[PDB]
Design a protein around this motif. Sequence first.
Motif: not given
Lengths: 224, 223
Positions: A14-23
């Motif tokens: 229902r809720t997605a969080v995209v993570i690509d921290v190093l930049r």
Amino acid sequence: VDVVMAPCSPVECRTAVVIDVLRATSTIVTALSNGASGVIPVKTIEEALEKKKEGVLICGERNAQKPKGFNLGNSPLEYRKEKISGKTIVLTTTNGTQVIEKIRSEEIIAASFLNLSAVVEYLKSKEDILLVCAGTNGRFSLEDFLLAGAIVKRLKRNDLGDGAHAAERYFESVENTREEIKKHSSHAKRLISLGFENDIEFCTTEDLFKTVPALVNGVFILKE
Amino acid sequence: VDVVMAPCSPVECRTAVVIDVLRATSTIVTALSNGASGVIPVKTIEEALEKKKEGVLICGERNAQKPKGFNLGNSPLEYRKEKISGKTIVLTTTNGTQVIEKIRSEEIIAASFLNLSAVVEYLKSKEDILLVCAGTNGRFSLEDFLLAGAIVKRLKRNDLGDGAHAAERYFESVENTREEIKKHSSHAKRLISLGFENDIEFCTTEDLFKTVPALVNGVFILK
């Protein structure tokens, strides 16, 4: 609710969080917090170049460096107000749109250490949450996993999927985010070798921004 | 050297270890340790059934249950010497071959808690090691990650990739494997709900075997 590292097939939530921290997501957060109209993730350098027009900046990286013909690289420090205010950012990084394309959700937001508390507060009232880490060259990304674990720990839920549980346990073992990533992340080492150690310090500085970028029709923007 | 959970593209490495603790690799290790001539990974149920013939047993699962027409399911407890000794095991599990296909390596072995120490000893002299966790239905598998972390901690190498470091740290946080998996593995919980609690205990039992299955031209055997 759960964490997935570089998914291969369509993931539903229902809720997605995209993570690509190093930049990447750090760049998205920084750009929008500094006035950019929106950030459009694109798959290839070729198609990124086809989108040049007034009011648009072609940005991104390959091998962590700005591609020939591009306006900006993928260093969040490049995204200053005087440089990107009011501009639409076409962004293409190594992980392209691989993560986004596999997400089947009602809402998709971008997270980084830079806007961690805002992300946590936003998620407290959300159900069926999936933290989607982009990974590094299809491999495990320590910094992505660490941010995911930090988020999980603060959501204080009891219905944790395998990935969320592992991420939280890993997070609990970390003495210092900055040191941990500089010492144990392969991508962080690559960045340091190219003179981007400053990016690692910036990207791991918590709460410099209180924004929560949302993906709307393929464009990360700020909305109420 | 590193750990990958359900890789999407082919991963290249000198030495690879396939991990599908909740049954797949536990079954492979148990079968060969109990006399099986070899275990052949097969993609579809259709293919598995065709290979039917004297001296061959069609085994595997879909939804964790034994498919119609099959001889055995995917419970290691089913692979007794008195039943499979000397026979070839055709094995098809949900995403078995899909994971193996991603491994671009000349040396591939199978691991479970069941043969943990034997695997570590085998890897001692190996370079460029990649522990490949199968995952479950595209999701993170806690039990695979835990075994990977256990292996990494035992090797004590000076060069760990992101996945290996995370797995090792996670492993260090676990006081009891059996309870950790029963409480936090979604797949283990599904298996328990299907009546396979004994499988959870057996698959998390350390060193019941000292064998190390090797994938040799499409067939897992004991060199």
